[PDB]
Every structure is written in structure tokens, then in C-alpha cells.
């Protein structure tokens, strides 16, 4: 009656959830679904208690009455006097990335090129990019802007899924979970790295974590950051070291959500779970680390230092902020 049911998206998150369940003495248990939208439904039905979501999905969950509980907090320099759990969140930088060799490609010449997105409905991979393009274009034909793309969650027969590759066997092409090879931050960057796409819409941190030896993964071993460039909104190109002056927007951190009637209880359990399996936690290297999954960002982003309390007991609109909320509303008017 005090246990929390986590919702895992796909086979791989399920496996990691099972491990966390095991080490937690079943204080945390697992439900699995094929997509993030399905996990939201399980939560609404009361069959699952919570899951960690990107801002775009927090908008979906919010309209159905779910609420933000704790947020991911990564390592920062400016508010260092405070402990991580009480520290305000910074947000992450949504960027557009391309290969240096693809000279001449800028924000103003993206039309008819190939694109890589984390997934439809997500912040850096979809909502920010497509919202900007719709506006600048005065057209809701965002499905006709790029020639081909990999945008998990779109119609598998459409050009928005033309570049997705599915799993080991070619199955599940374009599904919005980690079985799709080019899903998420890591998948979209891989889509660019292997030159399947011309541009990838991810966040500043993804570039760094997958270049100059930070990943050991087969496809990323030899990637150097100097071989990449960020596309700035003023039509210019810059090194990935200038993200603070060349980003598409700053995004609200991913956060854990749950039904409001279950928030207090989910918050309590999670705080104890991270004291055990978090970054400096009692059991981390030794038995289990909640925030690691070999660059796959399973359940949580691998660069998470801790889950932080929110303060001001924000509604979902307050958490996302009015700038971002109006952006999504406007883009949704199209769909």
C-alpha cells in the first residue's frame, strides 16, 4: 500500500526497472507500455503511479490532470552553495546540430534536407524546431518541409519515418521507444553521426556525451566535437562550445509526474530511493545506480545528478512556463 508502480517505456526500460525493483525490495515495482502516451493512460487509470517525462509529454499529461513531482537536476556551477535536491533547475539548451563537412548548410537552407528528431511531441526534438519552422513558414505543412526524416511516433509509411531503422531485425520501425535505433537524444545524434540525416535536433549535452571518447559505443568511438557545428537562428554556424549563444531555446528539465492524489506518496518514496541508488547513494557503484544505463538514458537521463524538489508547488503550466506553453498550443493548432 506504500509501494510505487513505475511505468517503463519499452523492453529496455523494463529490464532496468526490474533491476531497480529487485534491489528496492519491491518497494518499487514495474508496469510496462509500448509508448509514453500509453504509460500516461496507465497512470490515469491508476494501474501505474509515475514516470519521468520530457516537457512536451508533461504538457499532454497536464491537460489530463497529472502533476510535476520532482525534476531532474544535472551538474551546475552558478548555484553551488545549495545541495542538489533543493537547488533550482537550470533547464537545458535545445540545439540544431550538423556536420562541419556539410558546409554551406545553415538555418536558412534546411528546406528539403534530411532531419533527425528525438520523437514527435518532445521539446528539443520536435516542439521547438517545428514550432519555429511553422511560424517562419506561415504553413502547417511541417510534414512537407524536410524531404525525409526519422521522427519516432509519426506514421510509419510517411516521409517522417522514412529514415528510421527499427530494431536489430528491422521490426518496430519508427516506434517511439528505445527499440527504434534512432530514438531519443542519443538516437537522433546517431542518425546525424552516421550521415543518415543532415541535421539533428537534440540538446547541448548530447553532443558532448557522445564525442571525444565519452561513449565507447561502436558508432561514437571516433567522433570529435570539432567535426560538428550548431545552427544559430541568425543564419550563422558556430562551434559546439558556443551553445549559450547559439541555441533554439532553453527547455524545462524532464520531470517525474503522477496523479495529484498520489504525488505526496510518490515524492516520499523517490527521495528515499535516490539516497540509496542516486549519485552519492548508499548502494550506487556497488549494487545499483538509478541514473546510469550506458548512455541510453533509460528511465532517467544519464547526466542526472539528483531529482530535485520543485518549490512553489507549481502547476504544470507554471512548471513549463508561459513562453513554452503558448508555443505548444500554437503548434497544436496545426494538428
Amino acid at each position: 500500500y506504500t509501494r510505487v508502480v513505475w511505468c517503463a517505456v519499452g523492453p529496455e526500460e523494463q529490464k532496468k526497472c526490474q533491476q531497480w525493483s529487485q534491489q528496492s525490495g519491491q518497494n518499487v515495482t514495474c508496469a510496462t507500455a509500448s509508448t509514453t502516451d500509453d504509460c500516461i493512460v496507465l497512470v490515469l487509470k491508476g494501474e501505474a503511479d509515475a514516470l519521468n517525462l520530457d516537457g512536451g509529454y508533461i504538457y499532454t499529461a497536464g491537460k489530463c490532470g497529472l502533476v510535476p513531482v520532482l525534476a531532474e537536476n544535472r551538474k551546475s556551477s552558478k548555484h553551488s552553495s545549495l545541495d542538489c535536491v533543493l537547488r533550482p533547475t537550470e533547464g537545458y539548451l535545445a540545439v540544431a546540430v550538423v556536420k562541419k563537412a556539410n558546409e554551406g548548410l545553415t538555418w536558412n537552407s534546411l528546406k528539403d534536407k534530411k532531419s533527425c528528431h528525438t520523437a514527435v511531441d518532445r521539446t528539443a526534438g520536435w516542439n521547438i524546431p517545428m514550432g519555429l519552422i511553422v511560424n517562419q513558414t506561415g504553413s502547417c505543412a511541417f510534414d512537407e518541409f524536410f524531404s525525409q526524416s526519422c521522427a519516432p511516433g509519426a506514421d510509419p509509411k510517411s516521409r517522417l519515418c522514412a529514415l528510421c531503422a527499427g530494431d536489430d531485425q528491422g521490426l518496430d520501425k519508427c516506434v517511439p521507444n528505445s527499440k527504434e535505433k534512432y530514438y531519443g537524444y542519443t538516437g537522433a545524434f546517431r542518425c546525424l553521426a552516421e550521415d543518415v540525416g543532415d541535421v539533428a535536433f537534440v540538446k547541448n549535452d548530447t553532443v558532448w556525451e557522445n564525442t571525444n571518447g565519452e561513449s565507447t559505443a561502436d558508432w561514437a568511438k571516433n567522433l570529435k566535437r570539432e567535426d560538428f557545428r550548431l545552427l544559430c537562428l541568425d543564419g550563422t554556424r558556430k562551434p559546439v562550445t558556443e551553445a549559450q549563444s547559439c541555441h533554439l531555446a532553453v527547455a524545462p528539465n524532464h520531470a517525474v509526474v503522477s496523479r495529484s492524489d498520489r504525488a505526496a506518496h510518490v515524492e516520499q518514496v523517490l527521495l528515499h530511493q535516490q539516497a540509496l541508488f542516486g549519485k552519492n547513494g548508499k548502494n550506487c557503484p556497488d549494487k545499483f545506480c538509478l541514473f546510469k544505463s550506458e548512455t541510453k538514458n533509460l528511465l532517467f537521463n544519464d547526466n542526472t545528478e539528483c531529482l530535485a524538489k520543485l518549490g512553489g508547488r507549481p502547476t504544470y503550466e507554471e512548471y513549463l512556463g508561459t513562453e513554452y506553453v503558448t508555443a505548444i498550443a500554437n503548434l497544436k493548432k496545426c494538428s
Binding site: 502516451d37 500516461i40 493512460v41 490515469l44 499532454t60 491537460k63 489530463c64 490532470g65
Partner: peptide, 5 residues
């Protein structure tokens, strides 16, 4: 309703 609003 699962796009509740």
C-alpha cells in the same frame, strides 16, 4: 478523452 483538453 486521453487528449483530455
Amino acid at each position: 478523452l486521453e487528449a483530455c483538453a
